[PDB]
Amino acid sequence: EDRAKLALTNGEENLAREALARKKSLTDTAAAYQTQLAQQRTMSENLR
Amino acid sequence: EDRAKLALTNGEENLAREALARKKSLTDTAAAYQTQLAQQRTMSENLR
Amino acid sequence: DPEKVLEQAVIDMQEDLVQLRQAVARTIAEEKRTEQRLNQDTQEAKKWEDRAKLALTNGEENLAREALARKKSLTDTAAAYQTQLAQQRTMSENLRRNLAALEAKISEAKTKKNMLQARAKAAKANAELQQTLGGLGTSSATSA
Amino acid sequence: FERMENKVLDMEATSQAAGELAGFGIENQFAQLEASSGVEDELAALKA
């Protein structure tokens, strides 16, 4: 998103929306990992 | 159904109704499996 | 015996989809081949018309009309190949539709047989519970 | 030169086979890329 702000500062809308795609991809991955974390904590208390 | 909403967003009614056909096909399969589940639970309590 | 047959039918379907993929690829070659011809052919008509323009520039009316005959011959061939192209595209969409349908048919035929087999096997397993319970202990142990 | 050009034309025939293969029904996969491109353009509208 910061790299996108560089394009906002001046220049490439193409870079800016490209950088949104990185931001989105990461965001989506973090939701998947947040889901994975719930499975870990539930399994942890199960073991406990 | 989400893939159908992409066509709603703009573009292909053909894709949209095609995606309804997937949704329908799945729905129908889930009713068959719901029926199968009743046979499992009944047989389970029979064994029990 | 059931499992043998049901799997065999599915096996056959895996051949079939590859065979029709070949036929599609073959058709792609027919379109490619005719494009290659028609594209050049239509230029050849121009080339000989250009050769005719050389006679227009000065000289031989005989060459000029001779060059028209080349142009005509090519033009006629290009109409024949344009006709051939219609047969290719029609046959292509025929294969495409046949395949798309066949793939759905195969897919569901396999899946239905599998889930049927699964539910049939599960059903006989439940029946085998009732049979083995019918294998009651109300037996010759009493006689002993 | 013709013999080896007959093989050039066979590669062109392989290109008819590549085009004859080329349609897949998966083209709809582009759509959210385009929508998200619009999203990064809305981030440009946010920038100004």
Swiss-Prot record, chain D:
Family recorded in the similarity comment: Belongs to the PspA/Vipp/IM30 family.
Protein known as: Membrane-associated protein Vipp1
Disrupted-gene phenotype: Essential, it cannot be completely disrupted. Cells with very low levels of protein have no ordered thylakoids, are barely green and are non-photosynthetic.
Full-length numbering of the shown residues: 168 to 215 of 267
Function: Required for thylakoid formation.
Subcellular location, record wording: Cell inner membrane
Transmembrane segments: none
